[PDB]
Specification:
The structure is cut from a larger assembly and holds 2 copies of chain A and 1 copy of chain B (121 residues). Chain A has 410 residues and is an all-alpha fold. Chain A has 17 helices and no strands. Helix content of chain A is 48%, strand content 0%. The chains are: A mainly alpha (410), B mainly alpha (121). It is classed as dna binding protein/dna.
Chain lengths: 410, 121, 524
């Protein structure tokens, strides 16, 4: 139907307007109106969206009454990604990429809606916690197909990565503006800042936030050749203006460490001058304020501080070695900050010119001496030789090999 | 009624396989005796009366008139009585013959201890 | 004003500007709920300037934009566009009528029209007669002729469920006595429309609303549409009291309901005290079904009521005899128990005209009997007197009439803030298992009765030894002999201490080759 809607343009020039109405009327009353919960008519939604995109390519003069059905369908298909099988979780990606290719090549009075479909999809996946519910750990595959390895996904369909990148950044900043992340007193006289005053008054927003930060972390390591270049001043200024009056909420330092790692991956630091003074004026404040914290907040603060560029922020090198002799003693029982301690001590001493450095070695190195001091289906398959079922439990039990939990011997 | 002339007008199987279901489709309008229901069936009986002389349905002709005479002579149903005796679509009108041109005079001729324990409590 | 002076030249842009102003006046309604109603007031006082929208010959998109515009306008404000001739109620109600009136759209293009009935089913019957008239015109012109007859998978029944679900949500949120009096009429036309479960749950949601002076109105409406002499068939007459008012009665009527119990009894105790003019079956079976409905209503009303206001001297028994005088207390139970014991005892040796519905009438009298014996003084041998203790010399057959004794039983072998920013995208867009014998419409009150006999106070005469006498003979009909064992099966906790006498007839049922087929397996 959706394929032959193409060549029927040159035969009637009204049936192309008859389809996309009959098609949307079939598409509505199957999984929006009735039997949205109990139905099995889910395994053809990729064919549905592929058909609607292939007719929307040829359809000019949009009705502008069914676009709140199109963009109430495509967020349903983005929502219904992990109730699937492999080698169809890629067909769903091809469908969504095809639709987003379709409604962006006709007019800029239309394509504002491409900025609210992804905003609604982010508010969809950033609130989920017999059955099982997938939390955020498998939408990351779709959101990396949609941006990073996309040139083998828009090849077979007739840039878009730039547009979807900018829409993702606008959505991830527009969520964090209205969240009400302030926290109230819960039921002696304490001293520390995390206390019985660790209770956010909007507890569903907090879960949205702690699902948002790890999602942004796993979505933006790379593909930042210039796609994160013009954003760093606005994004950094927003995060500083937030977290200066939001002290004891972790994750803000996590997003800051993400953008400052990208600001070191791109060059951006050969002094643009407006952020060079914000970082210098904030680094002193966290370096003096991080004494009276505790564990899972200290980890984020230290991973922020020991990733500042510091081949450029060389001035007052004594302002951070109490946060480098802390990154090693707080190692040895939680590894990936004992990794960033060595990864910062290797970055400093090869780049900082070796005369401000050399007095500061008897207070870095003497804390570096805690380091120099059955039956499954695989087994039952391997016990009866090798006949193709060890291939089954070698291929189907594969591809989850990305957790780089760094052990202690390396 | 008009949306069901698609079989006896293009092509079909053996003829009058629509007449046996037509009485089924027009009988069910008088289960509930509401006011607008009586006027939907008079359009059907004023819609096959013109096809009985056209589609060569003499065997339907003298058949579909006792169909609405028995249904008005079973019960009272006077609201459906007045609309079929004030206008009149009833028993065979012209001659019981397909070749004629005479009027409907025959229609106007046809239409004018088990008690001890009870009181103890 | 300046924006609606230009209402004909550029309709699309003024519609879009009005929508963008409307939802933005809806968004910050938490701090500025003064302008969000004043804007809707000011646009409703200017409906004269737009008439090329909701007229004929316009293509069918501006009309849907008018529907969505009016839907936003009336979903934002208060219920103020109806009352005391406030504003342009003629020229908004003419729009609301004429949009769904003419056969100009399709059926799923009036679905957006049938959404806003809760704001506009709270009028007086002057124009509301016209409202019911055009609703019934839609019913007789758009619904299927006889029954469903279209599976989900044709382009008519998918539409039909798409329309009826919106109807059911309208009836769910609007407690309106007219829409129920249409939905009950469209339901009871066959044996079962296959969407019964959402129907029953929706009726349950109607039953619990509060403001308890309106549930009497709902039950009064369905009672009056059941009671009158609109000459319907037997099935449609029975199905009302079967499955559209008993759902409301059983779920949640009222915790202190004496109104619908008081104002009904001298309307149907007379037709229970009536005769049978056995000359023609049309007046026969209708009177049987009316007696059956009165039986079931009195059954439920005796069941889910306390005993003090029905048995003691109160303001509920001074109804049947001589007004509000002190007669003797609890007389209604006496004049009911006499005629119900008179029922289910009529021998029908020559009576062979309509006997299955009379069997249903007998079983309904039985259920009413157990429900009133639930409310009797329930100590001495009333249990031995009533529901048992016949005298078969004068042809008193309790079980051999209500048990069918003609059907060959089958018996098979064995087998927060983001909810708000997510709703802003939704504002501006849009026991046992019953095989063959466990549903015999007598078993559950009998089992509850035997259980109540246990946890209320040799053989036990009228309910164990009497069944022992009526099971030990292999000369009794078969179906009663099978029916009586699925009481000691389901309630063996009473028969376990007296299982020393229940030792032979179960094995006589199992061993003798008179069970059915190759022997009725799973029973064995």
């Amino acid at each position: 139907y959706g394929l032959f809607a193409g060549p029927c343009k040159v035969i009637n020039a009204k049936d192309v307007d008859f389809m996309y109405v009959e098609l949307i009327q079939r598409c509505k009353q199957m999984f929006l109106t009735q039997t949205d919960t109990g139905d099995d008519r889910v395994y053809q939604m990729p064919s549905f969206l592929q058909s609607v995109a292939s007719v929307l390519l040829y359809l000019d003069t949009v009705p502008e009454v069914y676009t709140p059905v199109l963009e109430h369908l495509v967020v349903m298909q983005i929502d219904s990604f992990p109730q699937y099988s492999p080698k169809m979780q890629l067909v769903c990606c091809r469908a969504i990429v095809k639709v987003f290719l379709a409604l962006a090549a006709k007019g800029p009075v239309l394509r504002n809606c491409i900025s609210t479909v992804v905003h609604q999809g982010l508010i969809r996946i950033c609130s989920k916690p017999k059955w099982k519910v997938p939390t955020y750990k498998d939408y990351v595959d779709l959101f990396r197909h949609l941006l990073s390895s996309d040139q083998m996904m828009d090849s077979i369909l007739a840039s878009l990565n730039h547009l979807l990148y900018d829409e993702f950044v606008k959505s991830v900043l527009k969520i964090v503006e209205k969240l009400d992340l302030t926290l109230e007193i819960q039921t002696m006289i304490p001293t520390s800042d995390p206390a019985a005053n660790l209770h956010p008054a909007k507890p569903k927003d907090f879960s949205a936030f702690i699902n948002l930060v790890e999602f942004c972390r796993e979505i933006l390591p790379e593909k930042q050749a210039e796609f994160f270049e013009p954003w760093v001043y606005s994004f950094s200024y927003e995060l500083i203006l937030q977290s200066t009056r939001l002290p004891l909420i972790s994750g803000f330092y996590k997003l800051l460490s993400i953008t400052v790692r990208n600001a070191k991956k791109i060059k951006y630091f050969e002094g643009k001058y407006s952020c060079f003074a914000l970082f210098v004026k904030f680094g002193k404040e966290v370096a003096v304020k991080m004494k009276q914290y505790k564990d899972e907040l200290l980890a984020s603060c230290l991973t922020f501080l020991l990733s500042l560029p510091h081949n450029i922020i060389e001035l007052d090198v004594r302002a951070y070695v109490p946060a480098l002799q802390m990154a090693f003693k707080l190692g040895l029982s939680y590894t990936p900050l004992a990794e960033v301690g060595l990864n910062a001590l290797e970055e400093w001493s090869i780049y900082i010119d070796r005369h401000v450095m050399q007095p500061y070695y008897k207070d870095i190195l003497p804390c570096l001496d805690g380091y120099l001091k059955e039956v499954s289906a695989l087994s039952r398959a391997a016990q009866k030789g090798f006949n193709k079922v060890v291939l089954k439990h070698l291929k189907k039990t594969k591809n989850l090999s990305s957790n780089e939990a760094i052990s202690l011997e390396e | 009624a008009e949306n069901f002339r698609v079989l006896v007008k293009q092509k079909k199987a053996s003829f009058e396989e629509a007449s046996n279901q037509l009485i089924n489709h027009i009988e069910q309008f008088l289960d509930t005796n509401e006011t607008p229901y009586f006027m939907k069936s008079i359009d059907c009986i004023r819609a096959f009366r013109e096809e009985a002389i056209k589609f060569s349905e003499e065997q339907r002709f003298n058949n579909f008139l006792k169909a609405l005479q028995e249904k008005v002579e079973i019960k009272q149903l006077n609201h459906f009585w007045e609309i079929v005796v004030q206008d009149g679509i009833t028993l065979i009108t012209k001659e019981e013959a397909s070749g004629s041109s005479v009027t409907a005079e025959e229609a106007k001729k046809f239409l004018a201890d088990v008690d001890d324990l009870l009181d103890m409590i | 004003l300046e924006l609606m002076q230009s209402s004909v030249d550029n309709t699309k842009m003024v519609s879009a500007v009005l929508n963008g102003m409307l939802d933005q006046s809806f968004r910050e309604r938490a701090n500025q709920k003064h302008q969000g109603l004043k804007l809707a007031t000011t646009i409703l006082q200017h409906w004269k300037k737009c008439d090329s929208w909701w007229a004929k010959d316009s293509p069918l998109e501006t009309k849907m934009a008018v529907l969505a515009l009016l839907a936003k306008i009336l979903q934002i404000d208060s219920s103020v566009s109806f009352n005391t001739s406030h504003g342009s109620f003629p020229e908004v109600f003419t729009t609301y009528i004429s949009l769904l009136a003419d056969t100009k759209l399709d059926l799923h293009l009036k679905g957006q029209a049938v959404t806003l009935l809760p704001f506009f089913t709270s009028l007086t019957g002057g124009s509301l007669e016209e409202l019911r008239r055009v609703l019934e015109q839609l019913i007789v012109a758009h619904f299927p002729m006889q029954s469903r007859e279209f599976p989900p998978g044709t382009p008519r029944f998918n539409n039909y469920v798409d329309c009826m679900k919106k109807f059911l949500d309208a009836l769910e949120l609007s407690q309106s006595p007219m829409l129920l009096e249409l939905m009950t009429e469209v339901l009871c036309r066959e044996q079962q429309h296959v969407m019964e479960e959402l129907f029953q749950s929706s009726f349950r949601r109607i039953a619990r609303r509060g403001s308890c002076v309106t549930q009497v109105g709902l039950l009064e409406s369905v009672y009056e549409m059941f009671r009158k002499d609109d000459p319907r068939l037997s099935f449609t007459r029975q199905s009302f009291v079967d499955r559209s008012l008993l759902t409301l009665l059983w779920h949640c009527s009222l915790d202190a309901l004496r109104e619908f119990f008081s104002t009904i009894v001298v309307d149907a105790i007379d037709v229970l005290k009536s005769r049978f003019t056995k000359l023609n079956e049309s007046t026969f079976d209708t009177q049987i079904t009316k007696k059956m409905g009165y039986y079931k209503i009195l059954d439920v009303m005796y069941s889910r009521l306390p005993k003090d206001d029905v048995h003691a001297k109160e303001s509920k028994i001074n109804q049947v005899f001589h007004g509000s005088c002190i007669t003797e207390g609890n007389e209604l139970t006496k004049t009911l128990i006499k005629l119900c014991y008179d029922a289910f005892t009529e021998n029908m040796a020559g009576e062979n005209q309509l006997l299955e519905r009379r069997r249903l009438y007998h079983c309904a009298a039985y259920n009413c009997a157990i429900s009133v014996i639930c409310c009797v003084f329930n100590e001495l041998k009333f249990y031995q007197g009533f529901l048992f203790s016949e005298k078969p010399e004068k042809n008193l057959l309790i079980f051999e009439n209500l048990i069918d004794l003609k059907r060959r039983y089958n018996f098979p072998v064995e087998v927060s803030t983001l909810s708000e920013e997510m709703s802003q995208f939704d504002f501006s867009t849009g026991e046992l298992e019953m095989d063959e014998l466990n549903r015999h419409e007598c078993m559950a009150p009998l089992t509850a009765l035997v259980k109540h006999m246990h946890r209320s106070l040799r053989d036990l005469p009228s309910w164990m030894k009497f069944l022992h006498g009526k099971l030990g003979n292999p000369i009794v009909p078969l179906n009663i002999r099978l029916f009586l064992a699925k009481l000691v099966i389901n309630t063996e906790e009473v028969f376990r201490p007296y299982a020393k006498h229940w030792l032979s007839p179960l094995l006589q049922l199992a061993a003798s080759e008179n069970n059915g087929g190759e022997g009725i397996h799973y029973m064995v």
